[PDB]
Amino acid sequence: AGTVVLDDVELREAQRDYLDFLDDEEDQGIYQSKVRELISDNQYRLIVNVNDLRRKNEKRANRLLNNAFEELVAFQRALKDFVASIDATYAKQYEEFYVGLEGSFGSKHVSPRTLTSCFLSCVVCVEGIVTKCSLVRPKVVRSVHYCPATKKTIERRYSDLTTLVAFPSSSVYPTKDEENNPLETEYGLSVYKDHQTITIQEMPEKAPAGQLPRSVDVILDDDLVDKAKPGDRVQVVGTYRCLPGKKGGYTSGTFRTVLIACNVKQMSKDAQPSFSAEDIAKIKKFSKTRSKDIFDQLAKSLAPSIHGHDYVKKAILCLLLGGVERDLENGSHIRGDINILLIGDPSVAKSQLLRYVLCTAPRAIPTTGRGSSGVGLTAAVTTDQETGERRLEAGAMVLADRGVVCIDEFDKMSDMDRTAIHEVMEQGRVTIAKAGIHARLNARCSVLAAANPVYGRYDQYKTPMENIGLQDSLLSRFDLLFIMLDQMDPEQDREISDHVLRMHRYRAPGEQDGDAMPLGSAVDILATDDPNFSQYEKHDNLLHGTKKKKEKMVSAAFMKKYIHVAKIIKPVLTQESATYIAEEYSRLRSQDSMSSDTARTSPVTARTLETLIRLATAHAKARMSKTVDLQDAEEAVELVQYAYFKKVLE
Amino acid sequence: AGTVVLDDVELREAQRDYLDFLDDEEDQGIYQSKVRELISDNQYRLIVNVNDLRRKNEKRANRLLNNAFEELVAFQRALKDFVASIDATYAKQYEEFYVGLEGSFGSKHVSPRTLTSCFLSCVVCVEGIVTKCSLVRPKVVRSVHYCPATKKTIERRYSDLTTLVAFPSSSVYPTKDEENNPLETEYGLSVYKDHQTITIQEMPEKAPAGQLPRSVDVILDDDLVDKAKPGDRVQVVGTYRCLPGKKGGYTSGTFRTVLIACNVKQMSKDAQPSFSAEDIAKIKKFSKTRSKDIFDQLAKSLAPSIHGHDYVKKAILCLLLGGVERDLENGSHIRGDINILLIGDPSVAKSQLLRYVLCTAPRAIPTTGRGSSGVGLTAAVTTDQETGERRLEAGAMVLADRGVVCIDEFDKMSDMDRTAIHEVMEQGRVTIAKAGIHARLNARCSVLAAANPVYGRYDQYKTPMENIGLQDSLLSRFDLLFIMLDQMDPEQDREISDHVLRMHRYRAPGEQDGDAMPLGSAVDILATDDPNFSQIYEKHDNLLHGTKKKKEKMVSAAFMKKYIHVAKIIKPVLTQESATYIAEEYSRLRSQDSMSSDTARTSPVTARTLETLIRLATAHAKARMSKTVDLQDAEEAVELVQYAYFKKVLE
Amino acid sequence: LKDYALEKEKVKKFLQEFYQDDELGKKQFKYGNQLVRLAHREQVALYVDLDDVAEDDPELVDSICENARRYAKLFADAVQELLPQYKEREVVNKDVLDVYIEHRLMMEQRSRDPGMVRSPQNQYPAELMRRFELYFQGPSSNKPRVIREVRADSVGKLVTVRGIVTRVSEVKPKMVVATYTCDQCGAETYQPIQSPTFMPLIMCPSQECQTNRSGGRLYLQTRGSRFIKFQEMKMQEHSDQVPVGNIPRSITVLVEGENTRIAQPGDHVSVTGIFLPILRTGFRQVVQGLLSETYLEAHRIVKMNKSEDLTREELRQIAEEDFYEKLAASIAPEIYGHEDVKKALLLLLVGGVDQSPRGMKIRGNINICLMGDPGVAKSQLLSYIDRLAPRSQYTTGRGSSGVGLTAAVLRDSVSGELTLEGGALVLADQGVCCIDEFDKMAEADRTAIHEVMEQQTISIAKAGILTTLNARCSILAAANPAYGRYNPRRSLEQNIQLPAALLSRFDLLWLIQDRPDRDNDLRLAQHITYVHQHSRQPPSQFEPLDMKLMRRYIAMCREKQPMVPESLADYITAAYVEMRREAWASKDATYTSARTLLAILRLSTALARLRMVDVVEKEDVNEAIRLMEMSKDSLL
Ligand SMILES: Nc1ncnc2c1ncn2[C@@H]1O[C@H](COP(=O)(O)OP(=O)(O)OP(=O)(O)O)[C@@H](O)[C@H]1O
């Protein structure tokens, strides 16, 4: 053969439609700005919301989603044309520009179980958990060969025939000149694109509870390779395709299918935020208006469904803001995470606070007493069994690096596990070694833990030392230790019960009118978008989640935005704050700090001094202060003074 | 496997050298002018003299003559670049611009016999005669297809793998879409180049005597195809190459070789002369300065080695100049060709006049009395024997179209041959037919014949009718008849013997140095270039041993050739004074009482004699470059006819 | 794109006339002298510093870095063609490879007929005849890369990466040029080897066997063939360049030649090399295309921060009477207090001197157990010493237990068989093993540590393994004594809770208790707030030494074997018998044995090493005894 096409009508029309869609200037300017932004960010993939195409062109959107390969070829040619129009040299740098897809794939949004053969050559959106990743390998796309005898230089092109027919002429590597002079390959002048394969499995929480998991293979090519690691929950948008078998004279009719990714995005749509100019202005005004009691307002707005526990909510706000790590020049390290332990009577809502943090913070990992044992909590070392090499496996605390581990039923863990937690809790790292490999994994996680005292209910007539069952070294790791009692006072009972009944009465606004909460039975989730991978008035409207209109509460979305901005602040200890903190620490170390019939809940060590510093720093962050002023220090000291002592009754 | 050459150092150097040679603007821009000129007249092949390339870059010259395709493709890339620089639109209008070669090939000048295997892939110059041309076939170079099912149009290119390995995927003609939808070809959108194979044989007069002839197959591609016809003596320059066999599995090691032409040229005698502006100025000067006696100056300068026969020489000049053909509106035709017959005693230099006209005139064909027999003289009809069809074959008088047939020993020619040439000698065409084919071939020729009288010698005492053994129908279409008579007068013998002995003592300057013998033997010809296809011209010959001394010069042979070429194109128009004089002259010629007793008619006077008065007057006017046939022209015509048509019978 | 003849002329000019003033401001033609040494077979590896090339041809450096195999070949050719004119005398034929080379050259000149045109396959391959290796020291203008980020866009480029060596194979013969001989002809055939595997030749291609059309079967031979030292190492990302939720990424480094035997497992290295592919033939691959493995082809291996391989004032502070105190106070200056603890840790870094009398080895290593209350910088001191010591390993709790401390047999990758890999105590052999949370260490590990601390070996007789490992490592342990806290109501040996054997193995059992104390708590809190405020320890009288300088001083003190005089024997004996009498008489004392006397002796020899004297003096003994006494001071 050797035929060329003379202005194919469908490809011409498609490229015209796609370039019309991309050239957004008479329209809102969205994708024209996006293409500028990839030029400036020095990238060559544009992610296109398919809903925008449906809005602009139903016919393109449907044809693209149902005939993915040639449509995507048209739309990448149109993208290259458009990029050249904006900037021809940038378009000259990259051989091809790519298009990823995003948005709402209605029936094309599948799971690895539901990705059947009717989606072949369609765009699909598959969600699952990465079970295995291959190594990132380079695949040669253009080899350059020098002939030392003739001084000639040769280039050979290898087209991407991953899912196409590949005749053997298409894969020969040149080794000889025409008259059998040897060629030497120019590695630096050749072009490679790196290639990866991952397997996506149906998420265990979404799989039918009875049977074995279903998987799909995914080919990742350049820009997309290291986007996912084993254990990650990801969306992969791409084309579902049959791979060719080898040449043979006989075939079973059986084909091996893969998904060729055009886009990979993490479930952590909570690990990447989006700030508009108005959002930033709102944050700045919220911080400037009341730069004194802003912390209290944020704390009291934290777990609105839980009544009470004002100090505990302040402490959780400090944990969510964190301190600042000290990275000394000689490589030494002081941690900047706050670890909190909640001891208390049954049914005082400490699991509710852990659940709130789980649904609120980014990179938050849940774990219960005996459901994460040994190597499931810190890292593990296993042997590859294919290459025979040792590999690392990240446990709960490595996966929560720069995040939170919410350890529920902390008292029901084994002592082996609780002593494995020590190094992560203080030095923020996991050190694991077998013979062929030794690593030091970063686990810079804060620990929010909830436990019951020994005897299940807290005895008020015993010291907190013997109600908590924890040894002093472990207790020292937790910088704040809250005893949450069930004081059966009638007045506090009235407060709690009125609150609880108001939350049991609340009905969502208009969305519901007397109806039930759907179970979400695995075909309903694929019907809509996944909120996990999905795409701000500073206050909530008041109805009866609160009794009366006397004090406003911060919006959850705005609070996420505000805390994300404030977490980056690095306030500095001022000399007055440092002197005050030092004096308070020396007072607190002393016996006069505790009266008679009051007892220490946890020991006061140098870790308590860093606790004061970290709490004061978090308080300063809440105000966006850039300095740790005396008010921050005294707030931290009252937190510590509250948590570290308990009156014992007779 | 599909690779591209990122860097070919040799190709870069070659293309740079060829573009440098072509730019030429600093070096009196000869190829600059040649390329602009091919752009002007809408060609796409540039004929390159390899002597110029050898001057400018000898290393390229050797590489090109010895590695012909590599260097020729480099040189055609360079030529396309040069054309695009001069004119990008014309350059894009043609896909490929070809380079033909010219000039002197040292050992690369061969014949079909000496073209051996040591010349494969070299540029060679081969001279010979065309034995068979094929039909001009189109070869598809780019096929365009349309699928009505999907409205798609595809195109598929076919590289010229004539002398390269062709894999079967190279020649598959697409019939179906990938979905097995029928394709239909767009013939007017597809590109075809035409193709022809000829066979060139060693020339019979160059081959070793008695051996069988040797041939070479020659490939002609677009714009080179119809350049030769069977029986032409051509010079072909091309690459000598071994043709691929068909995909076998067993090979005998034998390859068919072929010449891939890059240029074809005819005998340069028949080609349009090159005319420098000084030459046209010299011609205009000649014609204007000497007008009354220019005809005699040209005539006596015709065959300088032949002494006397001044009227014969005037007539032969008229034959070389010709009358003007009349092409009436109703298709009727009147010939402008002059036919001349010389009858004479033995050894009166009439075979020499025939030979002179053979040397001088363009498109002059020799023949002897029985060397041509009918079919060999006029056309022929044969059967192709491989297609079963009738094929026309041109004989001597068709090949002499717009030329001269110099028939020698015309009397010893058989009667049927002369009957055959009756129709050509008046109508200038050959009517030929077997049952499957009929044709009316153009043979617009003038016949110059030499005959001997009956009894071998002319008898002064017998009537010229009784002495020329030809009938009035044959004689009457010979519009001038000259009895060249050997009178043994002693003073005439003085003159002739002096002239002849003087011609037998002359040595050519420089070439001859005192005792040299001229011959070369069957290798010396191929050692140097052929003076038959080879590419400052004075007016009068300098004085020499040809003439003693006098106040009357001798027109140079080269200048006379250029002058006659220019003058032959003229179409002088008969004026009314000339017409009246010629009419009354003819009426007087017909009436015998004007002519003396004891004076017989050599040839009859018919209306053909009037037509020849007109033709001779027109040729005279052409010589003066008049554009009108004046009374001097008519008088010269009448005096020539008067001299020729009557002879004194003695007793 | 570029003419390699011009480039070879460029590199020839650079080699011939590049000069510096390296030896005391003297222009010396840095690469000409090395070419001389290479021509005399006195030097094998030539390292071309691309900083030098950039000094006078920066675009040559850019070309080198963007196609590095090509320029390694060009530089090797230039050196080959320059060597004959830098030869001043005759090589003494150091080894057998040289004998082969000069026999081949002799026979080639003997049957030369120089004007004749030979076949291109009828000479010696260039790599068969070199005896030199050429490497690049990448320009300092190229920033070091992260192993994760060395990808397909850097194939064929000269890159530098940094990492920890996790696994390095043994040096093995990799064949470079296979040499065969014929049973018919007496010529040699040569097969240069680029692939990871080769198919040995069968027939010889010699001219004399092609003329004879004989069988000419050829025989593969190690004798005339050419091999190179070859190691394969894995190298891991540093903890500080791994992304947030990830594990470190390994790269395979193919080390060969003079670059072998530099990196051992656990070393912090910086590797310059070319990033190259290995074709992945064979594997019936899911994806069509030419997929390949990658590796780093090593050019320059440099051991980094703690693995790193003096001015008159320097010797001035070494000879200063307070050198010991200054070094000890440089130990983690961000931890306040712990002055004598830092002195003891300094002695552990220096160590005593091993004695081998009449076939009875007694170690010189010093072991220290910090058993303290919570939050007293034990883990910070352990981590600092791990950062500082040259061969240190840090282990915590039970994350590296069992074969993470001892060895395990592991499937080799290079050939494929069962190779022994060492754990922490092998990677820390002749260094420091920091064992944090010692009291919470699996009992099998504790028994292994028994044998390590006294015999300095690990004996294993499990199924796949029957070996004795060298573990000559000092042990720096940290523990909490009993229930997290020291309580005075219970004796030592009850809140120490170490068996007398394990307890006695430690030269110093340092007790730390943080009893609250108002002014002391203020001093600590001020120190800590300053550290949090400026990311450094507060200014003091003497600025603490850099870790590089501390390493240099400790290393100099290491090869300083001092001896114990006969004159001190009575003084030392009296100190020992005294310590032993308090142990017997006291009712709150730990186990005392002859190991206490050996502890005196090796502590005092470490002090003497710190003074860089060759004889232990009474003050060294005095300070050693004071340290042993302070180690149990907090219980007073
Ligand atoms: N202010 C409050 N105090 C106590 N319980 C509350 C409060 N507000 C709500 N609750 C409700 O109490 C119920 C039980 O709380 P939860 O299960 O979180 O208790 P818990 O402390 O985890 O108990 P346990 O220690 O046995 O796990 C929850 O449904 C929660 O909604």
Ligand SMILES: Nc1ncnc2c1ncn2[C@@H]1O[C@H](COP(=O)(O)OP(=O)(O)OP(=O)(O)O)[C@@H](O)[C@H]1O
């Ligand atoms: N007038 C003349 N001037 C010069 N040469 C002459 C003349 N007459 C005869 N000759 C010489 O006589 C020789 C023979 O002449 P030629 O062969 O042309 O005679 P011819 O007339 O053809 O004889 P025939 O009629 O027998 O064929 C020629 O070489 C020619 O040079």
Ligand SMILES: Nc1ncnc2c1ncn2[C@@H]1O[C@H](COP(=O)(O)OP(=O)(O)OP(=O)(O)O)[C@@H](O)[C@H]1O
């Ligand atoms: N002089 C000092 N004494 C005690 N602690 C200090 C001192 N200087 C700093 N610190 C702080 O102590 C904190 C670390 O606790 P550390 O590493 O001491 O635990 P540890 O000694 O191993 O105790 P545990 O027995 O509970 O494991 C560090 O953040 C460090 O900044």
Ligand SMILES: [Mg+2]
């Ligand atoms: Mg609970």
Ligand SMILES: [Mg+2]
């Ligand atoms: Mg004759």
Ligand SMILES: [Mg+2]
């Ligand atoms: Mg510790």
Ligand SMILES: [Zn+2]
């Ligand atoms: Zn042999």
